[PDB]
């Protein structure tokens, strides 16, 4: 009956595939995703979960409202059965914009707001340049949380290095390639600032 | 790759029809949430004086408060050659918008077909293209109408479907024409009027820094110059 | 609901400012109920309790449980269930659930097939609450009845994955040694025998072929033999029974295998589990290296076997007056003759033609009988080969065999003697390699611990041609080929049934016939052509027992220390593992004495450690869980005694089509079925094909045999409930809200006014005030609020007010005038006289509000007599 | 630019022979399938074979 925060977190892309191979364009897979919540903001009544589902490349996804969970739960497994298929365009309307109106009314349980200023908080070019000078960027050789793939051994004729059972953080960077890097900042609401 | 001809010793009948079948979707980026750089020195406006946003009807169920969720998806802009939206008010199931040189009726949730003998925010309906309030705080809502004081026209109006200049009718043109200023109302130093309403006795007080003109709806006549000046608030 | 005011227009009722009366249970009483619950597991059954439809006087009885209720369901013995209990009001409204705890079942299913009937026992939980204080509190809450309510486990938090028989596998000598197949699935189901009295049966005239043949089930026993005393057991024609053990000082592995590279050995170290879940639940056909543990829980009471045989030859018989295909009697017996259980139709004298002599005489009306094996030579059924004038005689075109072992009952082990593959701290009892589901093709079994071998390679769809390479290593006579076995004498008096029966005794090779030392050519007495091995299998689970810490093989145990493995001689190593310890084999024994017939070791694959079973044992996970009803509603007297009748586990007959034909035109095909009773979460008796319990079983296939209708495996999902938190604040007060009922039909049905659904609600503005009163005047409803007065548009004609029963939006008359004391309202022909204390007036609404106090001069009288307290008598 | 190498360890080989006419020898064996390179990764010496 109250407020709503912006999207403060988005999980990495997760692969709906089989434990040993991929899935054809027309096959349904028997998978389930375990969501482990840790140190949630108990002041809120509920925490909501969405799921952006892509069946092709750069296609209109299928957003589903998984559940409206209590904020004190510590685990939820998302079977694909439950969930309402919401419009993908209302993931931009979560929380909404921040405005400075001047007068209000109230009719038919609806609110009007007139003569409003859209409060956009920007970063000064001086601070942007200071951030771009103060950045000590380096390349490191990191890995995944597991870091040991015991599924593969030299006691086999063939082991398929399968990396779809993990997150989309399997991706790395080509050694001789140029990448245009940046950094963002988050407000107290979950609104991400521009890039520096 | 979604074919099962992987890691087998036979590999006798394999072919590009069976062996390297591919599902491109897994090669997807984080394209949904994407951003870009902005130029600080660039002038992109953020002020809309002639603009009205509309939220969703409150579900009054166990979900978010629609009022706090502003999407700017049902906007409505009034004429800009009258003036900024000084005040928006509702009287008898209808919203009426005061502008600096205008007064309109925002059609919203009017039944589709006839006014009288579907929640979509239809266009505005202008009542007066030249009369409009300039100090929001001289507006007092009452059963009879909306008492507002227009400094530009030097009058004390009452809207009850039709605009009525109470100052002219009851003879107060000079008093208002001599006590008008451009500076808006603010609590520290009274400069313009500040209208209240006594719901218990149908009395309307148009307060000023050195006087308090009282008006009674019981007789539709001004009563006195009360000694209630310089009071920030008077409410029921 | 607890409304505050009402109206009545167009036979419709309005109700405003209502509070939703939700009666909850306190956490203290919930915890007291969860402490006072004495839950136990009982062995109950159905009201009938005697299934006279099933008897041991039949070749097959299908235990069909769809003519009964859904209370046939029970509970898996080693499974965890989150239990609960509900209560019913005087109206039939069921309360929330009271979580009483996670409890493990302790009783298994039990089916006992007596002579004329069978009794199935269904495990059921039973909650007992006898604390009279808690019962009296529950009654004081208005409750009368109670019911069982459960959350069943998902496939991820299950302890037991599935339950099914264990089938030994087979492996060709060459191919173990080239690892191209290593181990491979058997044509035939190889059950263990309960005793060793069958070894003496295969000696002399003791074995009558009408009993059936016990397959080669010993661990490393070659599938074949040279002893004519057990000739009916021979499953392959190019087999010579070369043991899979060699002395490394004498010969290499290759040179040893080259004496019989087309020989097969059994393998109980690598088994093939067959459960109904894998075949019917497609989620278990995709497992890839599943870390599970194995435990053997029981046996199968094999009693009979339904066998068949068919022989079709491309060319006619050699003898012009010959008989040809002769069909004998093999194992087609009822359940009562249970001694000959786990027995098959493997080999026999299924052919009868004249002899191919050097001086040909097809004109004779005499007849020998010839051996016909499952995987037979790619040539003539009688003695011929390399025809010198054209085609062969009696050449094979298509042969096929069916078998249906029927397990009339399962005897389960005592809890003490249950066999666990992995026993911590036991060197011998190592665990199980990761489970693998075979569906269509290749399955690399992972490496087995404490073995220097690699990851094994497995196939169940075999398309092989077996060739007999001729050598003198096993015996001198094999430099010409494999011998041809026929009867000692001709069919003497038409007695071809007795001669067929006594094939163990009346059988001798063609060359050893002392009368035929010069009358038969060398090419018409030795067989030197391949054998076409072709068979397919169905979905199943394959795994392997890990080697012991000493390097030996862990093996299925032997009942009562009977029918053990083939022990290797001194200093002899397996041909697939030269660097093996002495003996190279370890097999334990289960001392089970309630089983006296052949059986399959009935096991369950289980997951020992399961974290966060139902999401958690905390109150949150229980709040996030979905519950289901279980049991009939009982009255609450001096004690609450609930019985959870409906669970999630069945106990039904499962016919596993282990093997079928690769094609419908191949020469040698095999069909093998194992009909036994098993536990499942899928309704096995929803099978809708009529190829059940028939002896033919020749053309059966996964296209015909195990067709399934999933709908019968449905839960009580329609009426589902969940837990609620007492301390949670969910509102039940709606001051600005108006419900609308349906127009009264005024016919013989319910009163629509009493049926409130909250489906046509309407909420007024909340910044004026609560709905003090609702009134109707001249066909229009008008709502008084504490600082407002509106007109509820309802049943106004669609288009014009004046010169369709849907509750349209409100129409406000005054945004500041509204009544605060409902009881000052009086309806009259002229309007609505109400007294507003806030405005200090006495109004009259007649389309337009009129202040009578001001008009007639009563402002002071009302302004002096007003108060905030509402009216009360 | 050549940046690295590949650690070849094993090779999965197969063979199939189908003849239109039968063997010349009436008692001949025909197609014989031998063992070639079907080994695990551990025996890495016989790589690229
Ligand atoms: Mg032991």
Swiss-Prot record, chain A:
Localisation: Virion
Primary role: Forms the muzzle assembly at the distal part of the tail. May serve as the gatekeeper to control the ejection of the cargo proteins.
Subunit structure: Homohexamer.
Record's protein name: Muzzle protein
């Amino acid at each position: 009956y109250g407020k709503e925060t912006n999207i403060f977190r988005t999980s990495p892309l997760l692969y709906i595939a089989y434990s040993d191979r991929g899935a054809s364009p027309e096959e349904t897979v028997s998978c389930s995703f375990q969501i482990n919540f840790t140190e949630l903001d108990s002041s809120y009544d509920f925490i909501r979960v969405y799921s952006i589902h892509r069946t092709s490349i750069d296609a209109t996804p299928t957003v589903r409202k998984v559940a409206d969970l209590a904020t004190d739960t510590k685990l939820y497994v998302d079977t694909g059965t439950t969930g309402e298929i919401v419009d993908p365009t209302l993931l931009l309307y979560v929380g909404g914009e921040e405005i400075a109106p001047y007068t209000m009314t109230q009719k038919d349980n609806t609110l009007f707001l007139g003569n409003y200023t859209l409060k956009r908080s920007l970063i000064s070019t001086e601070l942007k340049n200071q951030i771009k000078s103060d950045s000590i960027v380096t390349t490191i050789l990191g890995g995944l949380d597991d870091a040991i793939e015991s599924e593969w051994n030299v006691n086999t004729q063939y082991n398929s290095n399968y990396d779809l059972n993990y997150d989309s953080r399997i991706k790395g960077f080509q050694k001789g390639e140029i990448y245009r890097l940046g950094i963002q900042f988050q407000d107290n609401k979950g609104k991400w600032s521009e890039v520096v | 790759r979604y074919d099962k001809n992987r890691g087998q010793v036979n590999n006798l009948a394999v072919s590009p029809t069976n062996f390297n079948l591919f599902n491109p979707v897994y090669s997807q980026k984080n394209n949904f949430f994407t951003f870009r750089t902005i130029d600080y020195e660039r002038f992109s406006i953020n002020y809309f004086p002639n603009s009205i946003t509309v939220t969703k009807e409150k579900s009054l169920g166990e979900d978010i408060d629609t009022w706090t969720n502003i999407t700017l998806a049902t906007t409505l802009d009034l004429d800009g050659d009258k003036g900024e939206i000084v005040s928006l008010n509702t009287y008898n199931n209808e919203i009426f918008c005061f502008q600096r040189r205008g007064l309109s009726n925002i059609l919203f949730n009017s039944r589709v077909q006839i006014p009288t003998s579907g929640l979509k925010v239809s266009g505005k309906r202008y009542i007066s293209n030249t009369i409009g309030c300039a100090n929001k705080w001289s507006i007092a809502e009452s059963p009879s109408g909306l008492y507002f004081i227009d400094n530009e026209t030097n009058s004390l109006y009452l809207f009850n479907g039709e605009i009525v200049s109470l100052s002219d009718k009851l003879g107060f043109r000079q008093w208002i024409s001599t006590h008008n200023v451009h500076v808006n109302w603010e609590p520290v130093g009274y400069n313009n009027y500040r209208s209240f309403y006594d719901k218990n006795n149908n009395d309307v007080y148009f307060t000023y820094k050195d006087h308090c003109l009282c008006y009674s709806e019981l007789i539709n006549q001004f009563t006195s110059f009360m000694s209630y000046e310089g009071v920030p608030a008077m409410f029921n | 609901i607890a409304p505050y005011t009402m109206t009545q227009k167009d036979n419709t009722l309005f109700l405003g400012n209502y509070t939703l009366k939700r009666s909850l249970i306190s956490t203290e009483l919930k915890n007291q109920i969860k402490s006072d619950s004495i839950v136990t597991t009982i062995l109950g059954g159905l009201d009938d309790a005697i299934e006279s439809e099933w008897n041991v006087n039949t070749q097959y009885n299908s235990n069909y449980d769809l003519n009964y209720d859904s209370r046939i369901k029970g509970f898996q013995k080693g499974e965890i269930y989150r239990l609960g209990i509900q209560f019913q009001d005087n109206k039939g409204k069921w309360s929330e659930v009271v979580f009483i705890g996670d409890y493990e079942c302790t009783e298994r299913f039990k089916y006992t097939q007596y002579d004329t009937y069978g009794i199935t026992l269904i495990p059921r939980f039973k909650v007992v609450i006898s604390n009279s204080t808690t019962i009296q509190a529950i009654k004081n809450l208005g409750y009368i009845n109670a019911r069982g309510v459960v959350v069943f486990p998902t496939l991820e938090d299950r302890n037991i994955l599935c339950q099914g028989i264990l089938c030994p596998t087979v492996a060709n000598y060459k191919d173990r040694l080239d690892n191209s197949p290593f181990v491979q699935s058997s044509w035939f189901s190889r059950p263990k025998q309960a005793t060793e009295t069958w070894k003496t049966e295969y000696s002399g005239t003791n074995h009558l072929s009408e009993f059936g043949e016990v397959p080669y089930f010993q661990h490393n026993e070659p599938i074949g033999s040279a002893s004519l005393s057990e000739i009916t057991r021979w499953e392959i024609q190019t087999s010579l029974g070369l043991v899979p053990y060699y002395n490394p000082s004498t010969t290499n592995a290759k040179d040893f295998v080259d004496g019989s590279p087309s020989e097969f050995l059994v393998d109980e170290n690598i088994v093939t589990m067959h459960s109904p879940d894998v075949e019917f639940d497609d989620r278990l056909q995709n497992i890839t290296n599943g870390k599970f543990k194995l435990r053997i829980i029981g046996t199968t009471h094999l009693t009979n076997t339904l066998s068949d045989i068919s022989v079709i030859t491309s060319t006619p018989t050699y003898g012009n007056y010959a008989t040809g295909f002769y069909k004998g009697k093999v194992a087609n017996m009822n359940i009562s003759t249970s001694y000959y259980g786990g027995r098959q139709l493997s080999a026999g004298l299924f052919w009868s033609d004249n002899v191919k002599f050097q001086d040909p005489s097809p004109q004779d009306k005499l007849e020998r009988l010839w051996m016909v094996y499952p995987w037979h030579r790619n040539g003539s059924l009688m003695n011929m080969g390399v025809p010198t004038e054209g085609t062969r005689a009696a050449a094979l075109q298509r042969k096929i065999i069916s078998n249906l072992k029927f397990a009339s009952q399962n005897n389960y082990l005592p809890n003490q003697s249950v066999w666990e593959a992995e026993i911590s701290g036991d060197a011998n009892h190592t665990g199980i390699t990761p489970v693998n589901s075979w569906t269509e093709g290749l399955v690399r079994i992972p490496a087995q611990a404490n073995s220097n071998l690699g990851s094994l390679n497995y196939y169940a769809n075999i398309d092989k041609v077996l060739t007999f390479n001729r050598s003198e290593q096993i015996s001198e006579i094999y430099k010409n080929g494999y011998l041809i076995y026929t009867t000692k004498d001709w069919i003497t008096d038409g007695k071809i049934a007795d001669l067929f029966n006594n094939a163990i005794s009346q059988t001798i090779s063609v060359d050893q016939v002392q009368d035929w030392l010069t009358r038969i050519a060398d090419t018409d007495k030795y067989g030197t052509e391949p054998v076409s091995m072709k068979y397919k299998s169905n979905p199943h689970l394959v795994f392997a027992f890990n080697y012991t810490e000493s390097g030996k093989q862990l093996i299925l145990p032997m009942k009562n220390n009977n029918n053990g493995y083939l022990a290797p001689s001194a200093n002899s190593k397996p041909f697939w593992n030269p660097t093996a310890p002495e003996g190279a084999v370890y097999q334990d024994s289960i001392n089970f004495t309630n089983e006296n017939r052949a059986f399959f070791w009935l096991a369950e694959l289980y997951r020992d450690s399961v974290v966060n079973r139902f999401g958690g044992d905390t109150e949150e996970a229980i709040l996030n869980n979905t519950w289901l009803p279980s049991g009939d509603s009982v009255i609450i007297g001096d004690s609450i005694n609930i019985e959870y009748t409906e669970g999630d586990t069945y106990y039904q007959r499962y016919d596993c089509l282990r093997t079928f034909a690769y094609t419908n035109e191949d020469q040698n095909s095999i069909v093998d079925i194992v009909s036994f009773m098993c536990e499942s979460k899928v309704n096995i008796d929803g099978r809708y094909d009529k190829n059940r319990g028939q002896v033919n079983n020749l053309a059966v296939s996964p296209t015909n045999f195990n067709l399934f209708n999933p709908v019968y495996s449905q839960k009580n999902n329609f009426f589902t409930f969940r837990t609620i938190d007492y301390e949670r604040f969910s509102i039940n007060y709606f001051p600005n809200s108006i419900t609308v009922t349906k127009e009264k039909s005024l016919g013989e049905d319910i009163d629509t006014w009493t049926n409130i659904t909250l489906a046509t609600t309407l909420d007024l503005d909340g910044d004026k005030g609560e709905i003090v009163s609702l009134n109707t005047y001249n066909n229009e409803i008008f709502c008084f609020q504490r600082r407002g007065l509106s007109n509820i548009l309802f049943n106004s004609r669609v288009q014009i007010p004046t010169s369709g029963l849907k509750v349209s939006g409100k129409r406000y008359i005054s945004n500041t005038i509204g009544c605060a004391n409902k009881w000052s309202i009086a309806e009259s022909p002229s309007g609505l006289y109400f007294i507003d204390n806030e405005t200090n007036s006495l109004y009259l609404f007649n389309g337009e509000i009129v202040s009578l106090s001001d008009k007639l001069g009563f402002r002071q009288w009302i302004s002096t007599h007003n108060v905030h307290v509402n009216w009360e008598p």
